[PDB]
Amino acid sequence: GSQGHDTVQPNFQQDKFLGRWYSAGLASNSSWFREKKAVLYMCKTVVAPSTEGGLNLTSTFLRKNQAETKIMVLQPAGAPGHYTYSSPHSGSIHSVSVVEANYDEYALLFSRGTKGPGQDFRMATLYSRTQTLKDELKEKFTTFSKAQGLTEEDIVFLPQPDKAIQE
Template sequence: MALGVLCLGLTLLGVLQSQAQSSSQDLIPAPSLRRVPLQPGFQKDQFQGRWYVVGLAGNAVQKEEEDNFMMYSTIYELQENNSYNVTSILLRNQHCDYWIRTFVPSSRAGRFTLGNIRSYPQIRSYNVQVAATDYDQFAMVFFKKTSRNKQYFKITLYGRTKQLPEELKERFVRFAKSLGLTDDHIIFLTPTDQCIDN
């Protein structure tokens, strides 16, 4: 009897381990920061202000959920210590939701880490890198987070307006695919006038 219970326990443990491995294998591996372009001569003062999130791509983004994603905005406010206070504003459950965090500059201009990371015990590391921007029309920003032994990454396509030319969207898709993502991991968000212009 005890041997039977032991065998059953070991079998269940093996099933749980294989499920955990397969769920982490489902994530496309996150590239190193060295593989991601960094905007040359990044101008921190020109980058600040409101950006609309026009597109999202990432190893945890699902194309089939595209219709559920409404556009949101993110405001970068440059501080005296060269960090940014970053506020994202989105419509959630018919209410305006504000998500505020701090991006602290690293040794390379255009690369940041999450400030006060100790407030997020589940996050081991969080990096942000401005891959490309013209400051006036668009930006592509890379995010990489390590949480509970999994690495997540995403790229946002920011626009100073809610609509961007098709060639910029195509450039965004090419960039996402160059980092190993597929069409199933790339979405464009539905514009809205609720909350995100506040």
């Protein structure tokens, strides 16, 4: 019947979206995020294969000030676009999956956080693919999130490309 979006895009190939990708779409209720978004930097995530047999995601925040390199590893869970970002040995964990992409641009992922007994977190990840922000993704990401019970209270977009040069 009526259902979709939340599901994962069947048959996905990261090799088609490999390389550097700009960000500009994220949905998370949060509470103290404002204290961090106040200085939101350009999210430049890099996808690549990790050791053993997983994915090595290198995050880099580019702003007018400087750049910060973060480390994010995505280990394949089983289906093309389903991984586990756990860490402990019993509890306090979270996972993320792939929603859908626009042929070869604007990546949309779904996050299901639940660290501890059960917090029940629902965050969304959306990547950009233009000079500026893309409404198509702004709409599809927010509409899917808001249509399923949400709104501006759960939306945060990252700045556009930063620092052209690189030291």
